[PDB]
Amino acid sequence: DGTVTIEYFNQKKEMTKTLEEITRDFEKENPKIKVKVVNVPNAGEVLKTRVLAGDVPDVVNIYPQSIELQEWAKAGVFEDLSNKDYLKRVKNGYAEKYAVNEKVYNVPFTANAYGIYYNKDKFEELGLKVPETWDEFEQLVKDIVAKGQTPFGIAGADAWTLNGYNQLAFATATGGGKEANQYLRYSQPNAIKLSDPIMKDDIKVMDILRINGSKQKNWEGAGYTDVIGAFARGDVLMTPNGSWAITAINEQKPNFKIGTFMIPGKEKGQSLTVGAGDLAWSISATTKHPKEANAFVEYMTRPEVMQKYYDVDGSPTAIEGVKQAGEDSPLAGMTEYAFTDRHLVWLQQYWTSEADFHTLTMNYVLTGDKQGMVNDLNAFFNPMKA
Numbered sequence: 001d002g003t004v005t006i007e008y009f010n011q012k013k014e015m016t017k018t019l020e021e022i023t024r025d026f027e028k029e030n031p032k033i034k035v036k037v038v039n040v041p042n043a044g045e046v047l048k049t050r051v052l053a054g055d056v057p058d059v060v061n062i063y064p065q066s067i068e069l070q071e072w073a074k075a076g077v078f079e080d081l082s083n084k085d086y087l088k089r090v091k092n093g094y095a096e097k098y099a100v101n102e103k104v105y106n107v108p109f110t111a112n113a114y115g116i117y118y119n120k121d122k123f124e125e126l127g128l129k130v131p132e133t134w135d136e137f138e139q140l141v142k143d144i145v146a147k148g149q150t151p152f153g154i155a156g157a158d159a160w161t162l163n164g165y166n167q168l169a170f171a172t173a174t175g176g177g178k179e180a181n182q183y184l185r186y187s188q189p190n191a192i193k194l195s196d197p198i199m200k201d202d203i204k205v206m207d208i209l210r211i212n213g214s215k216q217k218n219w220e221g222a223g224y225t226d227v228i229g230a231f232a233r234g235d236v237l238m239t240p241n242g243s244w245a246i247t248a249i250n251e252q253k254p255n256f257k258i259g260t261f262m263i264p265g266k267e268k269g270q271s272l273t274v275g276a277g278d279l280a281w282s283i284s285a286t287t288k289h290p291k292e293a294n295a296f297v298e299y300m301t302r303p304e305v306m307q308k309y310y311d312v313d314g315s316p317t318a319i320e321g322v323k324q325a326g327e328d329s330p331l332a333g334m335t336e337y338a339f340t341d342r343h344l345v346w347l348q349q350y351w352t353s354e355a356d357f358h359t360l361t362m363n364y365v366l367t368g369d370k371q372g373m374v375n376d377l378n379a380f381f382n383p384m385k386a
């Protein structure tokens with residue numbers, strides 16, 4: 001053979017094409033190395049299965065805030081990257097941010113954010129403005145309905161799309177990420193009640209997606225791809241999603257300027273965003289080819305390589321020498337406070353799972369059962385407290 005085959009386990013499905021191009025560039029420069037890019041459905045569950053078996057892919061796209069990364073890093077599943085030369089290319093101290101036992105196990109090239117995509121053209125046309133408060137967000141939705149347009153595209157079949165929305169609902173209601181987890185995670189069993197002012201505020205924010213005529217027809221069974229199409233064609237004026245979606249929206253070739261805005265707080269200047277490492281790689285500690293795996297990770301840290309990724313993806317990067325877009329970019333509003341205190345880490349950093357949080361979030365948008373949602377939250381968080 002002479003050549004060596006390593007595996008990269010990808011979870012960035014929106015960026016598959018570009019990542020395969022980068023991989024092909026790496027292979028052209030490293031003839032003795034072949035990289036197998038894996039894009040399997042239910043990737044998180046497949047990864048969990050493979051880690052338990054000890055069949056860890058050479059390079060793994062794992063989110064560095066996840067309970068998986070934390071637990072697997074402690075178990076010695078991943079290579080210690082603390083003293084790698086290429087790690088100096090990571091700024092914002094972003095690699096050290098997700099350190100486990102004060103050791104780096106993941107290279108977070110980019111950070112994802114969450115907000116509301118909006119149609120700039122239609123907003124200007126209808127005389128609408130970006131909301132700065134909850135009340136203004138309520139009124140914005142109502143004004144759009146009154147003008148005979150659909151405010152939101154919601155992927156009712158994909159509950160994960162509203163993960164960031166409800167997390168920011170709690171974040172803005174409490175005052176931040178730590179305050180949100182104090183109410184939800186580190187509270188007493190069955191502490192979350194309907195009568196709680198924080199819970200009332202959460203419902204108020206969630207009820208923005210329940211305003212009369214706020215969602216598109218057949219939203220209940222609509223998917224992530226469907227909603228991307230709906231927004232891109234201009235069928236809906238807004239869609240709540242992460243910064244991961246913009247690349248897919250751009251691919252649909254919209255006939256308008258795209259903007260984003262952060263989910264506002266109760267008052268002006270209380271808006272927040274949520275996210276962590278997006279394109280974030282870890283190396284197997286039991287890789288048969290550690291030199292090749294490190295070489296693949298090193299390649300991605302190069303400024304001319306990340307620039308190629310960034311120009312398609314668009315999410316904020318922590319890599320040195322990468323030219324980032326200005327204030328005219330679609331993600332400008334969502335990613336204005338990237339790598340600051342207003343950019344809090346995913347709340348499931350301190351949870352055992354997140355799937356059920358997605359479910360209860362979307363189930364409320366489907367039903368409007370307030371007590372049911374309160375009940376769902378307690379049923380989700382109680383097992384973690386014991």
Ligand SMILES: OC[C@H]1O[C@H](OC[C@H]2O[C@H](OC[C@H]3O[C@H](O[C@]4(CO)O[C@H](CO)[C@@H](O)[C@@H]4O)[C@H](O)[C@@H](O)[C@@H]3O)[C@H](O)[C@@H](O)[C@H]2O)[C@H](O)[C@@H](O)[C@H]1O
Pocket residue numbers: 011012013014042043044045063066112160161163164242244276278346348354
């Ligand atoms: O808020 C959602 C998500 O945000 C961070 O990951 C960034 C990630 O978002 C998108 O992938 C979402 C992904 O969700 C589902 O996949 C699973 C479960 O099947 O969920 C796990 C975490 O996302 C993952 O391990 C599993 O594969 C869903 O089935 C799948 O279709 C979706 O793609 C986006 O597509 C991707 O490019 C990234 O930007 C955060 O780290 C996550 O914990 C989560 O909160």
